[PDB]
Design an enzyme around this catalytic site. Structure first.
Site, PDB file in Angstrom:
ATOM      1  N   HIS A   1      -3.880 -14.383   8.640  1.00  0.00           N
ATOM      2  CA  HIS A   1      -4.060 -15.632   7.552  1.00  0.00           C
ATOM      3  C   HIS A   1      -2.580 -15.737   6.135  1.00  0.00           C
ATOM      4  O   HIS A   1      -2.204 -16.573   5.847  1.00  0.00           O
ATOM      5  CB  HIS A   1      -5.024 -16.548   6.438  1.00  0.00           C
ATOM      6  CG  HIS A   1      -5.374 -15.561   5.780  1.00  0.00           C
ATOM      7  ND1 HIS A   1      -5.706 -14.496   6.081  1.00  0.00           N
ATOM      8  CD2 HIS A   1      -4.939 -15.177   3.941  1.00  0.00           C
ATOM      9  CE1 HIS A   1      -5.587 -13.267   4.463  1.00  0.00           C
ATOM     10  NE2 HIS A   1      -5.451 -14.201   3.839  1.00  0.00           N
TER      11      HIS A   1
ATOM     12  N   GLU B   1       7.646  -1.673  -4.504  1.00  0.00           N
ATOM     13  CA  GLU B   1       7.167  -1.843  -5.711  1.00  0.00           C
ATOM     14  C   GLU B   1       5.922  -1.535  -6.332  1.00  0.00           C
ATOM     15  O   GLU B   1       5.092  -1.242  -5.626  1.00  0.00           O
ATOM     16  CB  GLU B   1       6.722  -3.438  -5.276  1.00  0.00           C
ATOM     17  CG  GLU B   1       7.818  -4.519  -4.810  1.00  0.00           C
ATOM     18  CD  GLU B   1       9.079  -4.677  -5.690  1.00  0.00           C
ATOM     19  OE1 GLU B   1       8.854  -3.960  -7.069  1.00  0.00           O
ATOM     20  OE2 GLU B   1       9.770  -5.761  -5.293  1.00  0.00           O
TER      21      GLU B   1
ATOM     22  N   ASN C   1       5.464  -2.485 -10.036  1.00  0.00           N
ATOM     23  CA  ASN C   1       5.882  -4.523 -10.799  1.00  0.00           C
ATOM     24  C   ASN C   1       6.626  -5.202 -10.539  1.00  0.00           C
ATOM     25  O   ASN C   1       7.986  -5.199  -9.850  1.00  0.00           O
ATOM     26  CB  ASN C   1       6.440  -4.421 -12.395  1.00  0.00           C
ATOM     27  CG  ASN C   1       6.788  -5.225 -12.980  1.00  0.00           C
ATOM     28  OD1 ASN C   1       6.535  -6.249 -12.685  1.00  0.00           O
ATOM     29  ND2 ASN C   1       6.304  -5.352 -14.943  1.00  0.00           N
TER      30      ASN C   1
ATOM     31  N   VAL D   1      10.220  -6.706 -11.978  1.00  0.00           N
ATOM     32  CA  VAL D   1      11.585  -6.324 -12.210  1.00  0.00           C
ATOM     33  C   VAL D   1      11.861  -5.387 -11.484  1.00  0.00           C
ATOM     34  O   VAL D   1      10.906  -4.213 -10.597  1.00  0.00           O
ATOM     35  CB  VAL D   1      10.354  -5.352 -14.158  1.00  0.00           C
ATOM     36  CG1 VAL D   1      11.300  -4.813 -14.585  1.00  0.00           C
ATOM     37  CG2 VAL D   1      10.200  -6.420 -14.915  1.00  0.00           C
TER      38      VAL D   1
ATOM     39  N   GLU E   1      12.422   0.809  -5.241  1.00  0.00           N
ATOM     40  CA  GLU E   1      12.604  -0.335  -3.983  1.00  0.00           C
ATOM     41  C   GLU E   1      13.320  -0.454  -2.689  1.00  0.00           C
ATOM     42  O   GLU E   1      14.143  -0.027  -2.749  1.00  0.00           O
ATOM     43  CB  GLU E   1      11.929  -2.160  -4.906  1.00  0.00           C
ATOM     44  CG  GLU E   1      11.191  -2.466  -6.116  1.00  0.00           C
ATOM     45  CD  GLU E   1      12.512  -1.866  -7.208  1.00  0.00           C
ATOM     46  OE1 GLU E   1      13.031  -1.559  -7.612  1.00  0.00           O
ATOM     47  OE2 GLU E   1      11.391  -2.652  -8.148  1.00  0.00           O
TER      48      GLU E   1
ATOM     49  N   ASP F   1      -8.423 -11.467  11.658  1.00  0.00           N
ATOM     50  CA  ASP F   1      -7.094 -11.276  10.854  1.00  0.00           C
ATOM     51  C   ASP F   1      -6.325 -10.673  11.104  1.00  0.00           C
ATOM     52  O   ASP F   1      -6.636 -10.058   9.700  1.00  0.00           O
ATOM     53  CB  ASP F   1      -8.423 -11.903   9.490  1.00  0.00           C
ATOM     54  CG  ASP F   1      -7.464 -12.593   8.875  1.00  0.00           C
ATOM     55  OD1 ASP F   1      -5.984 -13.096   8.654  1.00  0.00           O
ATOM     56  OD2 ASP F   1      -7.798 -13.010   7.204  1.00  0.00           O
TER      57      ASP F   1
ATOM     58  N   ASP G   1     -13.756  -6.307  -6.909  1.00  0.00           N
ATOM     59  CA  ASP G   1     -13.625  -7.273  -5.168  1.00  0.00           C
ATOM     60  C   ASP G   1     -12.147  -7.504  -5.816  1.00  0.00           C
ATOM     61  O   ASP G   1     -11.774  -6.936  -6.349  1.00  0.00           O
ATOM     62  CB  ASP G   1     -14.325  -8.235  -5.725  1.00  0.00           C
ATOM     63  CG  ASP G   1     -14.572  -9.127  -4.351  1.00  0.00           C
ATOM     64  OD1 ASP G   1     -14.072  -8.661  -2.438  1.00  0.00           O
ATOM     65  OD2 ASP G   1     -15.293  -9.885  -3.898  1.00  0.00           O
ATOM     66  N   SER G   2     -11.771  -7.461  -4.305  1.00  0.00           N
ATOM     67  CA  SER G   2     -10.390  -8.251  -4.594  1.00  0.00           C
ATOM     68  C   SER G   2     -10.709  -9.822  -4.344  1.00  0.00           C
ATOM     69  O   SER G   2     -10.915 -10.410  -4.529  1.00  0.00           O
ATOM     70  CB  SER G   2      -9.303  -8.125  -2.935  1.00  0.00           C
ATOM     71  OG  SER G   2     -10.760  -8.278  -1.852  1.00  0.00           O
TER      72      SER G   2
ATOM     73  N   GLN H   1      -7.870 -13.572  -5.118  1.00  0.00           N
ATOM     74  CA  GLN H   1      -6.427 -14.768  -4.087  1.00  0.00           C
ATOM     75  C   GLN H   1      -5.443 -13.932  -4.585  1.00  0.00           C
ATOM     76  O   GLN H   1      -5.501 -13.062  -5.779  1.00  0.00           O
ATOM     77  CB  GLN H   1      -6.205 -15.813  -5.224  1.00  0.00           C
ATOM     78  CG  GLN H   1      -5.615 -16.315  -4.576  1.00  0.00           C
ATOM     79  CD  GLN H   1      -5.772 -17.760  -5.100  1.00  0.00           C
ATOM     80  OE1 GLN H   1      -6.274 -18.779  -5.775  1.00  0.00           O
ATOM     81  NE2 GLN H   1      -4.731 -18.892  -4.587  1.00  0.00           N
ATOM     82  N   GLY H   2      -4.645 -13.428  -3.785  1.00  0.00           N
ATOM     83  CA  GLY H   2      -2.929 -12.395  -3.736  1.00  0.00           C
ATOM     84  C   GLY H   2      -3.121 -11.587  -3.637  1.00  0.00           C
ATOM     85  O   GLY H   2      -2.009  -9.993  -3.277  1.00  0.00           O
TER      86      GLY H   2
ATOM     87  N   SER I   1      -4.961 -10.860  -0.637  1.00  0.00           N
ATOM     88  CA  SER I   1      -4.828 -11.140   0.896  1.00  0.00           C
ATOM     89  C   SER I   1      -3.302  -9.762   1.854  1.00  0.00           C
ATOM     90  O   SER I   1      -2.974 -10.206   1.720  1.00  0.00           O
ATOM     91  CB  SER I   1      -3.986 -12.297   1.772  1.00  0.00           C
ATOM     92  OG  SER I   1      -5.407 -13.422   0.907  1.00  0.00           O
ATOM     93  N   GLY I   2      -4.059  -9.464   3.111  1.00  0.00           N
ATOM     94  CA  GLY I   2      -3.179  -8.826   3.836  1.00  0.00           C
ATOM     95  C   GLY I   2      -3.641  -7.051   3.093  1.00  0.00           C
ATOM     96  O   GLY I   2      -2.841  -6.361   4.221  1.00  0.00           O
TER      97      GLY I   2
HETATM   98  C1  LIG Z   1      -8.896 -12.615   0.371  1.00  0.00           C
HETATM   99  C2  LIG Z   1      -9.500 -14.179  -0.538  1.00  0.00           C
HETATM  100  N1  LIG Z   1      -8.153 -15.014  -0.733  1.00  0.00           N
HETATM  101  C3  LIG Z   1      -9.186 -15.665  -1.972  1.00  0.00           C
HETATM  102  C4  LIG Z   1      -8.615 -16.567  -2.077  1.00  0.00           C
HETATM  103  C5  LIG Z   1      -9.684 -17.335  -3.112  1.00  0.00           C
HETATM  104  C6  LIG Z   1     -11.096 -17.185  -3.061  1.00  0.00           C
HETATM  105  C7  LIG Z   1     -11.062 -15.807  -2.707  1.00  0.00           C
HETATM  106  C8  LIG Z   1     -10.112 -14.891  -1.726  1.00  0.00           C
HETATM  107  C9  LIG Z   1     -10.510 -13.585  -1.174  1.00  0.00           C
HETATM  108  C10 LIG Z   1     -11.797 -12.938  -1.269  1.00  0.00           C
HETATM  109  C11 LIG Z   1     -11.257 -11.981  -2.617  1.00  0.00           C
HETATM  110  N2  LIG Z   1     -12.757 -11.081  -1.634  1.00  0.00           N
HETATM  111 CA   LIG Z   2      10.284  -3.835  -8.770  1.00  0.00          CA
END
Ligand SMILES: Cc1[nH]c2ccccc2c1CCN
Ligand SMILES: [Ca+2]
Length: 223
Positions: free
Chosen positions: A40, A52, A54, A57, A62, A84, A171-172, A174-175, A177-178
């Site tokens: 995705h 990386e 920061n 910066v 890097e 995925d 939890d993980s 948004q952002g 991802s991957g």
């Molecule tokens: C991977 C991902 N991306 C999102 C975007 C908006 C809301 C939740 C998520 C999740 C899951 C997090 N556990």
């Molecule tokens: Ca950096």
């Protein structure tokens, strides 16, 4: 990452940032020329950023390397997020050192109860938005398949696992991802999806990397 801690600069040396003018996904370096991420996260014109901490910066460790080819899994389904996973080949090999290093692929699947490390530059709030500039980390266990299927009825395939806390709060997000889920020094998961972030009874869902090792190895060997 919601409810985590600041990893410390270059303490997660396999973590990469995928950049298309801005950070948009994480990934994991699996050898000097290949990165694994989530399908995705696919887009054209990816620059891979290694070493990386920061992301806003230049701190001195890097390496910025353009992608030459991306390979989304042949059976990726964007509606269900089954399969995925995606591979990205770098235009040139990274220089490996103590702060930029590959993570090993698993030889077996990890069991529920195993503690893992999840990392990324994603949102740190469950409601609202605050994006960190430095890498965040979270230790979380793999949940049983039964608890995972009970949290997400009809949505969990054999290529997914849940990790995190049924109580919420960590939890993980948004952002992230991957990015990597590493357990016992091996890459076992990829940050894939969930219902919101850190909500009660809604743990994160992760691609089950151990099911893909043959595809990864065959693909790298021929590309
Ligand atoms: C991977 C991902 N991306 C999102 C975007 C908006 C809301 C939740 C998520 C999740 C899951 C997090 N556990
Ligand atoms: Ca950096």
């Amino acid at each position: 990452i919601v409810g985590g801690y600041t990893c410390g600069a270059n303490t997660v040396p396999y973590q990469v940032s995928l950049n298309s003018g801005y950070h948009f996904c994480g990934g994991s370096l699996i050898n000097s020329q290949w990165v694994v991420s989530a399908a995705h996260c696919y887009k054209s014109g990816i620059q891979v950023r290694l070493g990386e901490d920061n992301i806003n910066v230049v701190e001195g460790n890097e390496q910025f390397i353009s992608a030459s080819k991306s390979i989304v899994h042949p059976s990726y389904n964007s509606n269900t997020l089954n399969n995925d996973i995606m591979l990205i080949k770098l235009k040139s090999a990274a220089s490996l050192n103590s702060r930029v290093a590959s993570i090993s692929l698993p030889t077996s699947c990890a069991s529920a109860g195993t503690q893992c490390l999840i990392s990324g530059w994603g949102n740190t709030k469950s409601s609202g938005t605050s994006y960190p500039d430095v890498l965040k980390c979270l230790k979380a266990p793999i949940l049983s398949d039964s608890s995972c299927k009970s949290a997400y009825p009809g949505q969990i395939t054999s290529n997914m696992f849940c990790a995190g806390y049924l109580e919420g709060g960590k939890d993980s997000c948004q952002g992230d991802s991957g990015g990597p889920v590493v357990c016992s020094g091996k890459l076992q998961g990829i940050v894939s999806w969930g219902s919101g972030c850190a909500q009660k009874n809604k743990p994160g869902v992760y691609t089950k990397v151990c099911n893909y090792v043959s595809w990864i190895k065959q693909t790298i060997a021929s590309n």
